[PDB]
Write a protein that binds this ligand. Structure first.
Ligand SMILES: CO[C@@H]1O[C@@H](C)[C@@H](O)[C@@H](O)[C@@H]1O
Ligand SMILES: CO[C@@H]1O[C@@H](C)[C@@H](O)[C@@H](O)[C@@H]1O
Ligand SMILES: CO[C@@H]1O[C@@H](C)[C@@H](O)[C@@H](O)[C@@H]1O
Ligand SMILES: CO[C@@H]1O[C@@H](C)[C@@H](O)[C@@H](O)[C@@H]1O
Ligand SMILES: CO[C@@H]1O[C@@H](C)[C@@H](O)[C@@H](O)[C@@H]1O
Ligand SMILES: CO[C@@H]1O[C@@H](C)[C@@H](O)[C@@H](O)[C@@H]1O
Ligand SMILES: CO[C@@H]1O[C@@H](C)[C@@H](O)[C@@H](O)[C@@H]1O
Ligand SMILES: CO[C@@H]1O[C@@H](C)[C@@H](O)[C@@H](O)[C@@H]1O
Ligand SMILES: CO[C@@H]1O[C@@H](C)[C@@H](O)[C@@H](O)[C@@H]1O
Ligand SMILES: CO[C@@H]1O[C@@H](C)[C@@H](O)[C@@H](O)[C@@H]1O
Ligand SMILES: CO[C@@H]1O[C@@H](C)[C@@H](O)[C@@H](O)[C@@H]1O
Ligand SMILES: CO[C@@H]1O[C@@H](C)[C@@H](O)[C@@H](O)[C@@H]1O
Lengths: 143, 143, 143, 143
């Protein structure tokens, strides 16, 4: 997964997520100014796929990140950053996934984030999972 | 791959890219208001991986989309939309890829797009390919 | 998948199974003496993985072949050859598979074939499926 | 990968090779009589794919095993057992691999092993690599 955002000074920030071949844990690599370095997510969570990532800036300029992967039980895991720590989101453990999830997100005029996550399930069907601010639900998407 | 943008009315547009198990060609599924439909990219390009996608809006409100996959020669293919047609971009055929590419992009203050594409290569090295408006180059990223 | 056997004259026979990128159908490539040719299985069956294969010779010198793949519903499919046609075996549709299955087989003193098939399931557990001549059952194998 | 052989008492021996999600090393699971156990190959070798396996019995009743995987440099690795140790075979490092290798083998009338290994290469071509007792060579196999 790759996600990026511009701060108020026009500096690009990159966050690159991958599954480490040597320990089965997600890696986060960060660029904030002039070099690559390790992110806090590194080595916290096991997965069995790569990760899809999306991010957004709130009205205060705080970055929010969401990372989606397949966990060690075959179900989608959601990892969240809002301020100062990674935590497992509400999506975690709800749905079986068979592919590296894709994700996109957008902010509406009220500052409510909307997220869409896409992954194959156990029946080889491409599914869309939707967040509009209350509960995850299965979307209308079909292949 | 999933990408999305908001138009001037606050309507979300979704574009979801996937590799068809039946014919080895990329599918584009589109949402503009109230239903999913097959996009113009569908069946124009063969690949052997999934697709990473990024997009941006120019100052006129025109969407630009870039889609990255592994082609049938084992090399990264770049598919481009700027207005009314899909075409193969400058990145195509330069580098071997061994994983579904990730991509991100941002617009600088001068309206110049910057793109970063990430994929494993034939040597099992995670590589970053960078566009800043002239030529693709290998970036500083490492795991 | 690859399987092979020696006939009574000491001639090698090779059978190589793969999933075609262009049509999502299994291909069988055959070697019996001096050239590769397309086997009868070719283009008959859709799958979403590669295929594992095993084979055995009965006391009359008749080859029997079993090929295992993930079907388009996410479940293991078994394709069988005993004499003159491919058919779907008893294993088909019983279990979810999340990996290209592996298979091995042996003949006991009474000429009864025993088959063992290994694949991850939807819960990311490596499973063994066993045939000893009556019904498929889940074996004692654990990772 | 799965391989099996019958000893002189008619007892089945199973050897199941897999890539461990926890450490990126090959696991060998063994059945000789009444239980599964970890074999000596376990945790010796890193890989980035699953493993294909083949085995044969020599005239003394000694098993020989060959295991094929993609190593951490993107090239096929060959792991060999003839009596009492695993070692890297002559195929290791020669060819790029982009898929879990398949392998089969047969003994000719003189007791010379023949091995055939199949894997995609970096150019998305299915390749056959052949051993007849001197050097590995690219075979006539095509799709
Ligand atoms: C300040 O912390 C750095 O940036 C945050 C936005 C997160 O990506 C975090 O894991 C990383 O270590
Ligand atoms: C407030 O809830 C947290 O953030 C939302 C935007 C979602 O990512 C949800 O799954 C998560 O638990
Ligand atoms: C309102 O419908 C929901 O949101 C739309 C933007 C799409 O993601 C659609 O598939 C989904 O069911
Ligand atoms: C109007 O055309 C639709 O939208 C464009 C932005 C592209 O996604 C195109 O392939 C699609 O058919
Ligand atoms: C103008 O060149 C086109 O657009 C750029 C933004 C890049 O995607 C490039 O590879 C492509 O050929
Ligand atoms: C200027 O350096 C280039 O751009 C940065 C934003 C990073 O993508 C870096 O790896 C790359 O080499
Ligand atoms: C004679 O038929 C050839 O050999 C048989 C053993 C099968 O492999 C069949 O699919 C193939 O066409
Ligand atoms: C006789 O039944 C057929 O052959 C056996 C050896 C098994 O492969 C079984 O699943 C298949 O239906
Ligand atoms: C008797 O046990 C059955 O056969 C053995 C040969 C093993 O395959 C074992 O896991 C299985 O349960
Ligand atoms: C006796 O040793 C056991 O059997 C051999 C045939 C090999 O599979 C070895 O790794 C394993 O530990
Ligand atoms: C004697 O050579 C060893 O055994 C042969 C049968 C091959 O597996 C070869 O690559 C390996 O080095
Ligand atoms: C004699 O030809 C060699 O051996 C045969 C058994 C086949 O493996 C063939 O593709 C290879 O070139």
């Amino acid at each position: 997964g790759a996600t990026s955002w511009l701060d108020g000074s026009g500096q690009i920030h990159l966050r690159i997520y991958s599954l480490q071949q040597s320990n089965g844990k997600l890696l986060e690599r960060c660029w904030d100014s002039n070099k690559w370095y390790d992110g806090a997510l590194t080595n916290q969570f096991s997965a069995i796929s790569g990760a899809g990532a999306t991010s957004w800036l709130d009205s205060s300029g705080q970055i929010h990140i969401r990372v989606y992967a397949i966990g060690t039980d075959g179900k989608i895991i959601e990892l969240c950053w809002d301020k100062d720590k990674w935590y497992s989101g509400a999506l975690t453990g709800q749905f079986y996934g068979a592919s590296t999830p894709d994700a996109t997100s957008w902010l509406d005029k009220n500052g409510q984030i909307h997220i869409r996550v896409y992954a194959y399930n156990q029946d080889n069907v491409q599914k869309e999972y939707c967040w509009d601010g209350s509960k995850w639900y299965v979307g209308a998407y079909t292949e």
